[PDB]
């Protein structure tokens, strides 16, 4: 009587136990198999982005907006409407015609890691080893993430880090088919018009002449042709710039020179990736605002094209023209009190998203 | 005993909290992780539609056959590429220069053909329509390019293969796929269902939920159930065919992909149209010629497009249309008899460049 429920029971919950192990089986395995469906999926979507971008030409540019920090709470932030992974717009909290809703390659959440930035740009140095030149630059007001994106702190690094790391991995490879790739380097700061070498502590005189090469390109004399060694080696050539460096509105210009010697045959690649951290878009506008010109430039302007006004934009001169993938980041912090300047920062982003197309060498000489 | 079996109850009221509970969790991470797979997916099916929109939707492609051993001795001309995009011929005896969006010599493997087609299959999966073509004059490839050979198969063949394995792939997103295929023949302005033997007539009216969509009557439309049956089907297609006299015979092959999602209860379909032109020469006279004029019209963006003056140009109509992809492979004879037509041939690709 007793004996007999219990043991009734016993079974009954034998069935469930077998049921909720085999359902629990199965959910482990469409759940295994769903995400890596979904890592596959991401991998041909951010690869037909790269090939898109591609052919829409060779002006990128890309928009991160900043969390607010453990200091921002009370701080009025302007409403923030992301409407697609590349379109998004900006309300002000207060009242409200103009443009608010703004398209660009590729708009970055504040939630987006520094990974996700630079998974994005590891494309364009890739490339850069085939023979391609790249420029990157930070844009935006102070305190959006200028710093934060393009350099790295402690904890996260930034673009520069982590390309450096990405540059000696691919090198090794290249090493193993017989190209012997060398890095070099290049750091300097335009602080008010004037370039200072971060390399060199000695103080000296740079200045920007058409690359006695060739007139397409633009080359720079007195700066310290440091011949990079190994990650660290750059690493350490990173805190030794940062230490000149100390600053929040300069324009810090490095220039990774790559170059490549095959065994197979004497030929030799071209990487002149340009990792540039601009600063000050709020108006003081040193240098940035010949930025601008040349960027309104290339959209009206054709084959003339201011070329001074800005130690920058001279620097940039191969970029500008022709054969160099350049890419933006839009920094904008997201408080209500820089609404303005945060759109600005957006307006200029139009124009960069309007730029004309540019053209690329196979670099392989 | 009756404390022994007092305690298991207690052990397995337990390890199925644990279990019921561990069943909660894994439920949530796959309903989100699918929502991810689905918008993961769905951004990926655009970027793919954008680039394919900037490669072009109506490509034009040629491909000049290599000489047959058979004709070693027949004479060719004067074939000089200009660069991958552009071809000239010159009668071994003005200037005879086209320039293509690809050009193929006659080294060019079957499967660097499909490298042209392949991303379009990943189209009709998408739920676009595509179109395959293989203008020329008989003996330029058209029968060699589409179907192929048994050691090196055309592009229907890969097309296949391919279909099948991105279906079994599309089957862990969720997405369940099925395969219709229709071949068939016009003829002096008339079709025939090749895959039946007794002769029925045919007729292309609307689609029953779709007036834009084609519908064809009594012709057969076998549901595919594996590559297996597809074989047997395609060699079936090869039967009531002979007059022999494909000279003047379009073959249409089109294999419709019918996918559904059950779970977001969403439908993709896309119809891929292999159609294998009749030969180009001046001796279908109305089809031929009209499937050119449909395609021109199209270019230059007419806003009426006489789709119903041919056979042709009406049962592909919905494939035709702005959101779907056409592929045109001229197939030409690298002789020197053949000269004067494999320049009409080619005249024709300069009309498209031109209309754009
Ligand atoms: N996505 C982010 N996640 C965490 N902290 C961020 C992010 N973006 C910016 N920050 C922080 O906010 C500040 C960004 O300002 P910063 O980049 O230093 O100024 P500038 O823009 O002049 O270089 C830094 O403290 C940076 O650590
Ligand atoms: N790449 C190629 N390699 C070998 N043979 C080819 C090639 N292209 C065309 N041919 C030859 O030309 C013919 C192709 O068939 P074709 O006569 O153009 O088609 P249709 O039967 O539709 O008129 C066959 O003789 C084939 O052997």
Not at 135 to 152: H, P, R
Not at 185 to 211: C, G, H, P, W
């Amino acid at each position: 009587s007793m004996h007999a429920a219990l043991s009734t029971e016993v079974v009954h919950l034998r069935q469930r136990t077998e049921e909720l192990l085999r359902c629990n089986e199965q959910q482990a395995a469409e759940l295994e198999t769903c995400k890596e469906q979904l890592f596959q999926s991401n991998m041909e979507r951010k690869e037909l982005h790269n090939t898109v971008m591609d052919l829409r030409g060779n002006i990128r540019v890309f928009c991160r907006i900043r969390p607010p920090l453990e200091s921002e709470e009370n701080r009025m932030c302007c409403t923030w409407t992301y409407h697609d992974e590349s379109t998004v717009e900006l309300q002000s909290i207060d009242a409200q015609m103009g443009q608010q809703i703004f398209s660009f390659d590729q708009v970055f959440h504040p939630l987006s890691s520094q990974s996700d930035i630079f998974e994005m740009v590891s494309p364009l140095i890739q490339s850069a080893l085939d023979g391609y030149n790249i420029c990157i630059f930070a844009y935006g007001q102070t305190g959006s993430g200028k710093t934060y994106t393009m350099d790295g702190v402690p904890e996260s690094v930034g673009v520069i880090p982590r390309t450096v790391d990405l540059l000696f991995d691919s090198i090794r490879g290249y090493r193993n088919l017989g190209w012997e790739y060398e890095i070099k380097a290049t750091f300097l700061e335009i602080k008010n018009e004037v370039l200072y070498d971060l390399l060199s502590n000695e103080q000296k005189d740079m200045e920007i002449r058409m690359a006695k090469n060739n007139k397409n390109d633009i080359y720079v004399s007195n700066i310290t042709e440091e011949t990079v060694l190994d990650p660290n080696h750059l690493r350490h050539l990173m805190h030794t710039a940062k230490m000149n460096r100390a600053s929040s509105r300069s324009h810090a210009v490095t220039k990774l020179e790559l170059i490549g010697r095959h065994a197979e045959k004497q030929e030799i690649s071209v990487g002149s990736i340009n990792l540039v951290d601009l600063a000050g878009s709020e108006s003081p506008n040193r240098s940035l605002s010949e930025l601008t010109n040349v960027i309104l430039a290339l959209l009206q302007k054709q084959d003339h094209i201011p070329y001074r006004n800005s130690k920058l934009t001279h620097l940039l001169m191969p970029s500008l023209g022709g054969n160099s993938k350049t890419l933006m980041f839009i920094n904008v912090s997201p408080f209500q009190d820089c609404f303005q300047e945060s759109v600005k920062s957006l307006r200029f982003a139009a124009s960069v998203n309007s730029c004309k197309m540019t053209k690329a060498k196979r670099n392989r000489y």
